[PDB]
Every structure is written in structure tokens, then in C-alpha cells.
């Protein structure tokens, strides 16, 4: 789906598969979090469904030893003194030893501060232990987490349940038309994007010799030239848009290992899984009730939340017993208006537009010489038109699919293209969609605060700050303290400070709250980027104070307070809201659960080969399933006829459904249901 999605999939740890266990065989002991997993396997990252605890992510600092066990790095302490020397330890090896937590205060030389320190011991047991007995200490605070886990700002403020979804959903973020970096980060956004292999890294140093949208060429110091080719508009495995763009300009001095051109969801070589949005924490006329989300039309009119999706459509001309399938522009009983967007071959021309039901690849097959209808024979003598022996088997656009045709790939057995035995011409047609975000599209943040788009108001309807700036997104207050994911609030506060900028007061000295605050942050520009590393970063003290240092806008006016709130004007009534609303910026990811894919409906269509029931799946234009649990709901209501209908004329009554259709189109009354063909199958299966 996105670069991170792939990276995480390379670091999955599955207990399933041959040699392992089945899903049913797995008890409750296997799945939950074990004491040994620390620094080796992430405790957070794992699926929500029936696969929970059986699929895990490998921790950041971990590695695999030649014997197939998981080693993890630890800092070595000689005698109370931390040494930079690092040895990897296996699980059982760690047990025989005694490990200090990473955040334990350390002398500028390397010695401990307090004799008794926090200590990790075998069997997941913890106890204060004198410094003389400290063998090793953890490399980093963020040692126990995975890659996707470490991108969740203020993780230590969100409960594991919503933090879990937080990780799982980032892998579901969809590449937008162009990508912004997050205002609030953890620092992991950099290394993840590079290692993902879905950006472009320079092997050897030098100078950009020539740059184009197509490729970048670099002149090394030794004289050799290495050219990197840009992936431009390619379909992913999940129909997202892998598109790379050159960062550097021509004649830039580039050093080795530097990102010269990033790809999908990447800004300046950083994981860009979404946009920075102006949020407002308030219920709003019910339109955000039960996790629903309200959006500003700006997000549509400025393609902020717009993504590109590519599909791959295929068809082939085979050898039949009545001749051979030939792809052609000549299809029986079709006007030249429909065929208008075709070439001479029978293929759609690149750049043309396609709607559902339209024709992509005109293919015709010789139909079996069966005696045509004596009533259609009769109709062919009156109008004197002779029947063709070729039936329309063309490739038409699937329902719901649409967009511009952005490429054709023809393979011909004639052109020596090695095809499977029996195929003559094989066509591929790639259509891209520029899907603007809409109602029902699943949005999310990093804190497991999911939700679908309820309503998108016109830009003027939006609750706006004093200087007339309309907010972007209106989250519901109710659904926050229930989820224990108040990190999203922390991100928002830091989000506003990162947008407005700040400046601590140095007069009368460095304030006591900003005493642990590194020098580099005591002064911040508007729209600056920062890091809040997991189990480190911003503390609640520094955050409150930063809300006091929020720089005024272009009109010299401060917009939010030290509480973090501000006063909004209802864009509908005009009157200001009675109470201060919390306002700031939050990173929002467009998830790959869009209505355009999920929506589906069917009158009639295909049917099961044996049971004569409808087929199943949106890919098969199949019907829904009215299961055993739904049958009860019917019976409990006592709606016998409706229940009878659904399980008869709507399903597998061979003669029934046909006469239902006729009755409807004739405007008559619905006939009495017959015998389910499914039941007839049973009596034949019992015999």
C-alpha cells in the first residue's frame, strides 16, 4: 500500500505455516506478550482479528544469529560504569544476567547516579538493585518497539489497544498526489523511508550531471557515471501509485547515501503517510457522532487528500473448436459512437476516458453453429439481415471502475512473444483514477483514532479562528477519553506549537520548566519539524510552557492560549462558540478503505454452478449472504413471506427468479415461490 507497509511485511514474524502450528491449535499462551520479547519482538504490532498474537513484528535493534535465535544489543557496564562496547545477547543468555533500563541516569563519565536502579531480571521480574550488581543496560528507550510502532508520537500516553490499531493502520495509508512530512515526528520517519527501498539513494558521491522527470544521472569523482531511472506511475500490488520525483536540482553536490529522489508517501526522504491538518476538538451538530469525521471542502478543492489508483485489466484471444478468438474493432450490433474510443486493432487509445460498461478490448469469438431461433430466423428474414457466427466476448469496464487509460501492453504470438499454448493476442489495459476524498472514506491518525468521513462542509461553513482561517477537520470530543489515546491531544498541542513557532523567555534566566529542554528548541520558526522519540521526547511540563510561547500570527495576534484552546466562530450562525475549543495540528492518514472500492450492489447476475445460489464477492458481481444468524432475526420478527422470498425466488429457485423478473418488468404481481433447487441437491446427495 505504502513504502512502510512493505518494510513491515519484510519484518513479520509468523507462527503459522508448515513446521509450525495451525490457527485452531494455538491456545491463549502462545499469543500473549512474553517477557523474553523485550528488544526482540514488538509487543504492540500484531493483527486484530483471529490472527492476533500469531503474527509479530521484529524489534528495531534486534538481529538474527546463525543459530536462528534472536539476539538484541545491550550496553556493557564494567563496574557501575557504562561502556560504549556492545554485545548481542540471546534470550536465555540475558536471563543469567541483570539488565538496567536505558533511561537510568548516567554520569558524564559513565557511572550511575543512584546505587539502587531499576533492573530487569529473569521471569520478567523487576527489583531495585545496587549499582555494583548492574551487568548490562538497555541500548535505547525505544528498544522494545518495532519500526511501525516507533512512528507513533507520545506512545507512552496511549493504551495498548488503540496503540495497536495505530501501528496496524499506518500500513494502510495511501500515497497522495504529493506528500507532506509530519509536523510532529519521532525521528524514525527518516531511516524508515530510506531502508524501505522505495526511494532513491545515491551509491557513490559526486555532482548531479543532468536531471529530468525520467531519470537522474550522477558524475562520480573517479569519473564513472551511474544513472538512476525513475519509477513513474506504476501500479503497486494493491493498486496504489508508486511514483518517484527528483529532489535535487542540476549541479547539486550530492554525497553518498543521500536521498536524491523520494517516492510515494515520502517528503525529502521521510515517511510521509499523510497530511498536517488543522483540527478542532468539538462535537458539531452531530455530524461527527460515533467516530465519524467532518472535513473542509478545501481538502477537495486543493487535492490535499487526493490519491491515485491504478488497475490492471486483461483479456486473451484463444483457439476454440469453432475457430479462434480474434481481437478486432468490428463487433456485431454496435454503433460507431461506442467504438469511437478505439484504434484500428480493437484496443482503446491511450489518453481516452472510460466509464463502466464501456469497451476496452474488442474481442469476438465464433459461436456454436446451433439452430438459431425459428422466431429469430423469422425476424432475420423480415429485415433481411444475415446472422454472424461471432459472439461478442469483448473486455468491458467492470462496474464502479473508471478514469483515464494510461497505457496499453500488447503481446502477440505473431510477434514471437512467447505465450502459453492456445493464446494468440493478449492485451493489458492500465486505467488510473484520480480519487478525490469523499464521504465514507476511512481516515485515521497514529493513535488508533480511526473513522470514516461523515460530511464535507463548504469552506465557509467551517468553524474558524479569529483571523479567518477555517479549520480542516472536526473530531468528536466524546470519543477521546474512552480510548485512553490522549497522545493525539498531545500531538495536537505540539502540532500548534510547531506551526506557530515559539520562543522561550531567556530574560531573568532560562525558566525552570525548560531546563531539560535542549538548546536547539528554545527558539522555533513557523512550520518547523521536531522529534518526540518513544519513551523520550516532550514531557507534559515542557508542552504546557511551549503553549505559552506560541508566536502571534501575521497580524501580531496570538491565536491559542496556554490551555491550548482558542475561540472559534461558527461558520453557519456567525456567533462565537460559548466556550474555548482546543485547536491545533494533527497528522492524518488516508486509509485504503475507500467507498469507491467497498460499495457494491446487484439485481441479478451469475449463479453458483452446483447450488444454483448466487455467486459471492464484489469481483464476481455476487450477492450478499443472508446467513443462519440473519434467518433467526427474520423468524423472530415473524415475517414469513419476506424470509420465504429471500431463501427462494431471490436465491436458487431456477424457474422462480426468471418469472419474478418478468412479473416486475411487466408490472404484474409477484408469483408464488417454488422448490429450492438447493434442496433438490440435498435429496440427490442423500440418495
Amino acid at each position: 500500500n505504502n513504502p512502510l507497509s512493505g518494510l513491515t511485511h519484510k519484518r513479520r514474524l509468523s507462527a503459522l505455516g508448515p513446521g509450525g502450528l495451525s490457527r485452531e491449535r494455538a491456545g491463549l499462551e502462545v499469543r500473549d506478550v512474553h517477557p523474553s520479547h523485550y528488544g526482540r519482538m514488538c509487543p504492540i504490532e500484531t493483527p486484530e482479528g483471529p490472527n492476533i498474537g500469531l503474527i509479530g513484528s521484529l524489534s528495531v535493534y534486534a538481529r538474527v544469529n546463525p543459530f536462528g535465535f534472536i539476539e538484541t544489543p545491550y550496553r556493557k557496564v564494567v563496574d557501575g560504569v557504562v561502556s560504549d562496547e556492545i554485545v548481542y545477547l540471546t534470550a536465555d543468555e540475558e536471563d543469567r544476567h541483570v539488565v538496567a533500563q536505558a533511561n537510568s541516569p548516567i554520569d558524564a563519565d559513565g557511572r550511575f547516579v543512584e546505587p539502587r536502579v531499576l533492573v530487569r531480571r529473569k521471569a520478567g521480574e523487576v527489583e531495585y538493585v545496587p549499582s555494583s550488581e548492574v551487568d548490562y543496560m538497555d541500548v535505547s528507550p525505544r528498544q522494545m518497539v518495532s519500526v511501525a510502532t516507533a512512528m507513533i508520537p507520545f506512545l507512552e500516553h496511549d493504551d495498548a489497544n488503540r496503540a495497536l490499531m495505530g501501528a496496524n493502520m499506518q500500513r494502510q495509508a495511501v500515497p497522495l498526489v504529493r506528500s507532506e512530512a509530519p509536523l510532529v515526528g519521532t525521528g524514525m520517519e527518516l531511516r524508515a523511508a530510506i531502508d524501505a527501498g522505495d526511494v532513491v539513494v545515491a551509491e557513490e558521491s559526486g555532482v548531479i550531471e543532468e536531471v529530468s522527470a525520467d531519470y537522474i544521472t550522477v558524475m562520480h569523482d573517479n569519473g564513472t557515471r551511474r544513472t538512476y531511472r525513475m519509477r513513474k506511475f506504476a501500479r503497486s500490488n494493491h493498486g496504489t501509485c508508486a511514483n518517484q520525483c527528483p529532489i535535487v536540482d542540476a549541479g547539486d553536490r550530492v554525497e553518498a547515501g543521500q536521498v536524491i529522489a523520494d517516492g510515494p508517501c515520502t517528503d525529502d526522504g521521510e515517511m510521509a503517510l499523510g497530511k498536517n491538518l488543522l483540527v478542532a476538538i468539538m462535537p458539531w451538530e452531530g455530524h461527527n457522532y460515533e467516530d465519524a469525521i467532518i472535513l473542509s471542502n478545501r481538502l477537495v478543492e486543493e487535492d490535499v487528500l487526493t490519491s491515485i489508483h491504478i488497475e490492471e485489466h486483461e483479456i486473451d484471444a484463444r483457439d476454440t473448436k469453432l475457430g479462434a478468438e480474434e481481437i478486432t474493432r468490428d463487433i456485431p450490433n454496435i454503433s460507431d459512437e461506442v467504438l469511437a474510443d478505439l484504434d484500428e486493432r480493437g484496443i482503446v487509445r491511450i489518453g481516452a476516458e472510460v466509464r463502466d460498461g464501456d469497451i476496452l478490448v474488442g474481442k469476438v469469438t465464433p459461436k456454436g453453429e446451433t439452430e438459431l431461433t425459428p422466431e429469430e430466423r423469422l425476424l432475420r428474414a423480415i429485415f433481411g439481415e444475415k446472422a454472424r457466427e461471432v459472439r461478442d466476448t469483448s473486455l468491458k469496464v467492470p462496474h464502479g471502475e473508471s478514469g483515464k487509460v494510461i497505457g496499453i501492453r500488447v503481446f502477440s504470438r505473431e510477434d514471437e512473444d512467447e505465450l502459453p499454448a492456445g493464446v494468440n493476442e493478449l492485451v493489458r489495459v492500465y486505467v488510473a483514477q484520480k480519487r478525490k476524498i469523499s464521504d465514507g472514506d476511512k481516515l485515521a491518525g497514529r493513535h488508533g483514532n480511526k473513522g470514516v468521513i461523515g460530511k464535507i462542509l463548504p469552506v465557509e461553513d467551517m468553524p474558524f479562528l479569529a483571523d479567518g482561517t477555517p479549520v480542516d477537520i472536526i473530531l468528536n470530543t466524546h470519543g477521546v477519553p474512552r480510548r485512553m489515546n490522549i497522545g493525539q491531544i498531545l500531538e495536537t498541542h505540539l502540532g500548534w506549537c510547531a506551526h506557530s513557532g515559539w520562543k522561550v523567555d531567556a530574560a531573568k534566566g532560562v525558566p525552570d520548566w525548560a531546563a531539560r529542554l535542549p538548546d536547539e528548541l528554545l527558539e522555533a520558526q513557523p512550520n518547523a519539524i521536531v522529534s518526540t522519540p518513544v519513551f523520550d521526547g516532550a514531557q507534559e511540563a515542557e508542552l504546557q510552557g511551549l503553549l505559552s510561547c506560541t508566536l502571534p500570527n501575521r497580524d501580531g495576534d496570538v491565536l491559542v492560549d496556554a490551555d491550548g484552546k482558542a475561540m472559534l466562530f461558527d461558520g453557519r450562525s456567525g456567533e462565537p462558540f460559548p466556550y474555548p475549543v482546543t485547536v491545533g495540528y494533527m497528522y492524518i492518514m488516508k486509509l485504503h478503505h475507500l467507498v469507491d472500492d467497498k460499495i457494491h450492489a446487484r439485481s441479478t447476475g451469475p449463479y453458483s454452478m452446483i447450488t444454483q445460489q448466487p455467486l459471492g464477492g464484489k469481483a464476481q458481481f455476487g450477492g450478499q449472504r443472508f446467513g443462519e444468524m440473519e434467518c433467526w432475526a427474520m423468524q423472530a420478527y415473524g415475517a414469513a413471506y419476506t424470509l420465504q422470498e429471500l431463501l427462494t425466488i431471490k436465491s436458487d429457485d431456477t424457474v422462480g427468479r426468471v418469472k419474478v423478473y418478468e412479473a416486475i418488468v411487466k408490472g404484474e404481481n409477484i408469483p408464488e415461490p417454488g422448490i429450492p433447487e438447493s434442496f433438490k441437491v440435498l435429496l440427490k446427495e442423500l440418495q
Binding site: 527518516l190 530510506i194 531502508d195 521536531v530 522519540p533 523520550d536
Partner: peptide
Amino acid sequence: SNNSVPGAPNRVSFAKLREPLEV
């Protein structure tokens, strides 16, 4: 700074100094 290794944009980090080993 956080990761001052590749030639990356400067992201400032609230931190205790992390110099054990890069990811």
C-alpha cells in the same frame, strides 16, 4: 538534531543524547 548521518532535513529532537548505535 536526531539523525545527522545522511544529509537529511534537520528534525530537532527533545531527547537524552542517543549515541549507542544507529538503527
